[PDB]
Amino acid sequence: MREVISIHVGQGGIQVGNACWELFCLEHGIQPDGQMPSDRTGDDAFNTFFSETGAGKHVPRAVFLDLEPTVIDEVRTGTYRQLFHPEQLISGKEDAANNFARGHYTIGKEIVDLCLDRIRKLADNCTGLQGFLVFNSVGGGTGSGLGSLLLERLSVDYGKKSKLGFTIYPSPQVSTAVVEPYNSILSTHSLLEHTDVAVMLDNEAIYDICRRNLDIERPTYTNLNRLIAQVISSLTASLRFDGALNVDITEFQTNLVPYPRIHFMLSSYAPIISAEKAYHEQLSVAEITNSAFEPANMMAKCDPRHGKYMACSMMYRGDVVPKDVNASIATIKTKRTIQFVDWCPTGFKVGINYQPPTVVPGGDLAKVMRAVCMISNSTAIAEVFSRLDHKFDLMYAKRAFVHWYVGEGMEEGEFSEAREDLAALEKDYEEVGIET
Amino acid sequence: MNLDSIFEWILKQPINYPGKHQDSQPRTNPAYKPLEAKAQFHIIFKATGEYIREKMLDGKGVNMRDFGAFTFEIFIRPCFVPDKKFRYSLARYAGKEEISAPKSQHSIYQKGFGMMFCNAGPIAASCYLGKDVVSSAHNAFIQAVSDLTTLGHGLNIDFGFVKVYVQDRDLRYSYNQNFANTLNNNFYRLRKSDTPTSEHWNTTYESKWAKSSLNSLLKRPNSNQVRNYYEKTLALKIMSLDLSTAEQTNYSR
Amino acid sequence: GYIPGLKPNNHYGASYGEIAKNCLSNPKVAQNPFKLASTGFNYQRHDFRDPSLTATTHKFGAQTLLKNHPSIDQKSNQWQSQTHDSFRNPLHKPN
Amino acid sequence: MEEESIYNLIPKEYVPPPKERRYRSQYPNDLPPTGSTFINHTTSRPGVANLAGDFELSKGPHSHKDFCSTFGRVSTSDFRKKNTGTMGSNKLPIIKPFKYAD
Amino acid sequence: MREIVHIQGGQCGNQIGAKFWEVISDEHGIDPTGTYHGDSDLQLERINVYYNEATGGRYVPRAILMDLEPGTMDSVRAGPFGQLFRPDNFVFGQTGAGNNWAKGHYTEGAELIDSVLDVVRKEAEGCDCLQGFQITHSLGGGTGSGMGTLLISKVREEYPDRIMETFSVVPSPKVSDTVVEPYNATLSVHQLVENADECMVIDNEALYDICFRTLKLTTPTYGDLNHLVSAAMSGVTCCLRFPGQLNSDLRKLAVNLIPFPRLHFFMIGFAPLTSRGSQQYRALTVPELTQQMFDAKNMMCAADPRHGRYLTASALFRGRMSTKEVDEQMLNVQNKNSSYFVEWIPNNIKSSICDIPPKGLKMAVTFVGNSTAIQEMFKRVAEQFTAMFRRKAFLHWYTGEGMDEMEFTEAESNMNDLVSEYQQYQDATA
Ligand SMILES: Nc1nc2c(ncn2[C@@H]2O[C@H](COP(=O)(O)OP(=O)(O)OP(=O)(O)O)[C@@H](O)[C@H]2O)c(=O)[nH]1
Ligand SMILES: Nc1nc2c(ncn2[C@@H]2O[C@H](COP(=O)(O)OP(=O)(O)O)[C@@H](O)[C@H]2O)c(=O)[nH]1
Ligand SMILES: [Mg+2]
Questions:
Q1: Contact E167, E121 (CB under 8 A)
Q2: Taking the domains of chain E in order of start, what are their residue ranges?
Q3: Chain A positions touching chain D (beta carbons under 8 Å)
Q4: A430 counts as catalytic
Q5: Contact, A396 vs A415, CB < 8 A?
């Protein structure tokens, strides 16, 4: 009776939702056609993600948005053609061309109304709506712009419903576009006061994880999407599987957000081990939680050793026992390389689930009986904000590429106020981090 | 319609003839004040009229893009043959051939002798206006076909030495006798080898333009004086708001 | 993106999915009756002549049009639209 | 409600706070990532970065930065005199007291 | 959906367009009879970008062929794939321009261009969603450099919101077959820099050098140069026509390649080009593709890219490859050449991936780069222009057809100012 609605906007959001929904279908046993696996053989656990249509198949509680017809048309052609509602894969006619102003003032206005129609058409059906999940690529025009418009409209239309954001900021030095700081800072302004929880998913860190652990020297976007889907499944499995210590979606904001302004945080996962050397180690809960807190395993390119810890939420799925979790937490607390802020004596919220992680054919991970996904709030996140700020100031000093944004209806003063908002956001973190 | 009602006809509906001619445009030279829409539209046609004969005084004739062609026939007598689009507007006008040309010479430029273009360059420079606004103004007026398609609306368009009449659909024209005798005096103009082929680089364009018939249509004002007046007026523009404040009394004197 | 048969010969009143299925499952849209290749040698192999010519002059000069026109099939709309049961069962799909 | 009076004339102006501080950032602009192995090509680094979380990341013999590495190129009197080369000038620097103990 | 139309004019433009349409027909599997025989499904999904569907099941390019002389088009019609082009779009004169800019822009261009404007309007209105226009022509020819520019101005003022592309053949001073090249080239450049949204210059002498040095073939011909130009042309729209890891259309390229409106001149290149007796020895990998991409000899223009600094560049990768190695190589080549990359913009290279390599190939890359080194050719053209203008050579032909030296003075002033403000950013420091 509890439902979460996933919003996928932009090419990155679509391509991560593909893996997420493939993982969900495989984990719940639903065929790509949308049916139970043939005439070979319900626990009513699929209700969190799927809904019964009254005759046979299930329909995912998702909506796809894009202005580029290519990805959506190719999805429609693909083998998951019969799974989604035909009018849930909303597609545009012209791309925003990496322009935030286009997708926020010119093109996205003719599609946001239809998206709102579809989203309320999905929301009125569910009775126990837990919240919303949104996936978008920040370094993209239509992605950031449409995400901004959707968040702004959803806030006023719904009020107290929680929203979770899994954004992908540009990497510190490695990227694919040349104008991404602009729409990056603009979307940062848009989401700062509109999203309740933001989870950092920089690509460079995931490339590092793959190279170091999975021993893959030729990785593509598919591996990154599979890892993100595993993170999402580990986060959500408490809402649909029995466990010894349950945590609901409403029980994350109330434990990881000390103040309303500060809700930016990064995630981690463990174990991430290739099958060639996977279980030639014991994978006790102690070493998997040690690997999770290891700084090199951060899913975002940040060093927690450079700042204090605010709060930590970690969830174990498998055959863990609370006493072992307590022992591991005590060991981590006694460890000196990791330090917590003074006004937070206890900073761990633990959840336990008995559903072991599922494996996908053609994947890279190994079939574990134990796993842990940890999301932490720390003051060290400000380094990415600082390095992103420095990049923007270089181009903006010489009016570089500004005429492309001004000519699309955006006022000149937007950049200055966005810079001020980044400055204030940085203002918050260092002030709260210092000892009283 | 005496070449002035056409100006009124073009102006009173902006939607049917949109363009930059409908509103005033700043002059290229700041020493010249702008002109209102009707005044600048008349000034342009004055300069074009002066431009046409000056080229026509030479052996080279001129034509418009879609309104007739100022040519001449050599056995020198001009006729101002019309254009095909302008010919379509005429209904009872007989298509009598004037200039005898063979099948080889098909384009109006080829069957001509010294065909020109009436470039917007010299016209814009003479009137101290932009090139685009003059071009748009010509395109606005060259749409006399729409007025001509309507019944009646007789036209006697002068713009200088030619005198062309337009009946219901008939076309008939008259020429200045003095200009006609001018063509038949000294017409070295036809051939090209008369010049010693040395002054093409020795003589600058400014010397040729200084002695040209253009740039003498309008009086040249004092650039310093008009700037002094404008700056003085602009000073009174902004700060004359208050009159009460004195801070300098001078009661007795 | 471009379901082929819809535009050139406009399809009549029916569902978009149904007409798309009909114009994709149809023959043609493939196979070489002429055996040319896109690489550019069978063009000089072939002749490029249309066998629908005759003669002219001194009597009639319009000439019959190309084969891009139906024949025999001239048959009224109510005939196609209204038949009782001789169609594929809409919901048969053997299990 | 509202009350009419003379003193309501000449309404008061709007006086907002002048300006908030432009910024304050204590992280350096160029922070080398801990495990960033994007950078180890043509360097004696076994597929891992510094991994020590060092702001500077001092570089030794190989490094990774060159001005004109791959497409660089666009006098008789000038030449190499006595000891301009690396292996010339068989001389040594001067001494320091040293610490060791730390 | 987001389809583009093709406009070609002049002898060089028609020659380029013939080979371009031959390559397009081959890569979409279109026989000279216009019958689709693609081996896959998605060679037909996006075929409407260039091919219109008519009754009888045949496909047709939405191209307009135009010139003042019918001599070129009657020859191109009799060539291979000549039945694809449609004589209804063929508009021709009967006089020609004779390598004169005045004739091809004022007398014959104006009176004849109404019909081609009509046909372009018809095609554009028939198109559902027009992505933009592309035009191929030469600046050393009379009818081309004049009439193509006038048509560009007209279509630009009629569709300001649509994008515009041109593939321009700049004349070269070493191998020059026309003695009046500086005049019409400068005149056409003056209007092109003002009107065209994107410009990509092509040099015949650079093509000669590339063909003789990389391919190492003894007998170059215009066919090979046309083929290389056509491959480079199709490399830009590969991402638009086919799915890929990172889709990118022409609008996205302009945003990422245009820092300021006036700087819209690019040089292009294609990889891999290998001598047929050596690719058994070469290895087709991402590093090899990137190094041949950034090699100066591979550039399609005589300008040396290492004489200036790259403002920005774009790379279009073709083939099933991961974003891993492409972005690694981009970052490495940018870090290793800090001298040649301007420093006040960080990460000035854009990378896009599409999954369709050219037929018979596994991987290929098309390079579009904006570098401050294009000013050199403009300077050398200008120096010839002023030297041959000071003596008033061959100006009687031009002044006998409506123009005066004030237009030339205005054109040369704009070109020199463009060069100055174009090299201004080369020396700029943060
Ligand atoms: N992690 C990850 N990021 C992706 C993926 N696909 C795209 N991105 C991100 O998306 C950014 C560029 O935006 P696009 O995905 O091309 O498309 P967009 O965000 O919708 O914006 P537009 O290009 O205007 O359509 C890149 O910088 C990537 O970081 C993916 O599969 N995985
Ligand atoms: N690449 C290429 N260039 C050509 C071709 N034909 C002519 N050119 C170039 O075009 C220039 C002459 O252009 P021209 O024929 O006068 O152009 P037009 O007046 O518009 O017909 C020469 O300098 C050639 O370098 C061709 O087939 N391919
Ligand atoms: Mg995109």
A1: no
A2: 3-256, 265-374
A3: 172-174, 204-205, 207-208, 211-212, 295-296, 301, 303, 305-306, 382-383, 386-387, 389-390, 420, 423-424, 426-427, 430
A4: no
A5: yes
Between strands E265-271 and E198-202, the pairing is: parallel
Nearest residue of E to residue B59 by CA position? E400
C-alpha B196, offset from chain centre: 33
CA dist B128 and B56 (Å) reads 23
Using DSSP bridges, classify how beta strands E51-53 and E59-61 pair: parallel, antiparallel or unpaired: antiparallel
Q: Experimental method for this entry?
A: cryo-EM
The whole-angstrom separation of Cα B98 and Cα A206 is 84
**Phi and psi at residue E199, in whole multiples of 5°?**
-135, 135
- Find chains touching chain D: ≥3 CB pairs under 8 Å: A, E
Q: How far apart are CA E202 and CA E171, in angstroms?
A: 9
Q: How far is the CA of A244 from the centre of ligand 3 (A)?
A: 42
Q: Could you list the residues of A known to form a binding site for GTP, using ranges.
A: 11, 68, 137, 141-142, 176, 203, 225
Find residues 61-120 of chain E whose CB sits inside 8 Å of chain A: none
CA distance A311 to chain D (A): 22
Residue E290 assigned as binding residue: no
Nearest to A353 by CA among A237, A190, A233: A237
- Residue in this structure with the two tokens 């933009």, named with its chain if needed: E132
- Token pair recorded at residue A134: 């949104």
Point out the residue among C9, C38, C46 whose CB comes nearest to the CB of E55.
Answer: C9
Q: What single-letter amino acid sits at D102?
A: D
CA E334/CA E341 separation, integer angstroms: 7
CA E369, chain centre distance (Å):
13
CA distance A215 to A218: 9
Q: Which amino acid is at A308?
A: K
**Burial (0-12, 13-18, 19+ Cβ within 10 Å), D26:** exposed
Question: E137 and E166 in contact (C-beta within 8 Å)?
Answer: yes
E305 in Cβ contact with E369 (< 8 Å):
yes
Cβ atoms of residues E13 and E145 within 8 Å: no
List the shell of residues around ion ligand 3, using CB closer than 5 Å.
A 11
Q: How far is CA E98 from the centre of its chain?
A: 24
Look up residue A276 and give its two tokens.
């060639």
The answer to whether E157 faces chain B, any CB pair under 8 Å, is no
Q: How many residues does chain B have?
A: 253
Q: Which ligand sits closest to the CA of A9?
A: 1
Strands A370-378 and A264-270: what pairing? Answer: antiparallel
DSSP label of E128? S
And the tokens for B48?
A: 């074009």
Q: Do chains E and A touch (3 or more CB pairs under 8 A)?
A: yes
Rounded to whole angstroms, the Cα distance separating E222 from E220 reads 7
Q: Are strands E63-67 and E163-169 parallel, antiparallel or unpaired?
A: unpaired
Q: Taking the mean position of all CA atoms in its chain, how far away is CA A269?
A: 13
Domain E3-256 has CATH 3.30.1370.10: no
Which residues of A are annotated binding-site positions for Mg(2+)? 68
Q: What number does CATH give the domain E265-374?
A: 3.30.1330.20
Distance from CA of E3 to the nearest CA of A (A): 11
The Cα diameter of chain C in Å comes to: 70
The H or E element spanning position C79 is helix C77-81
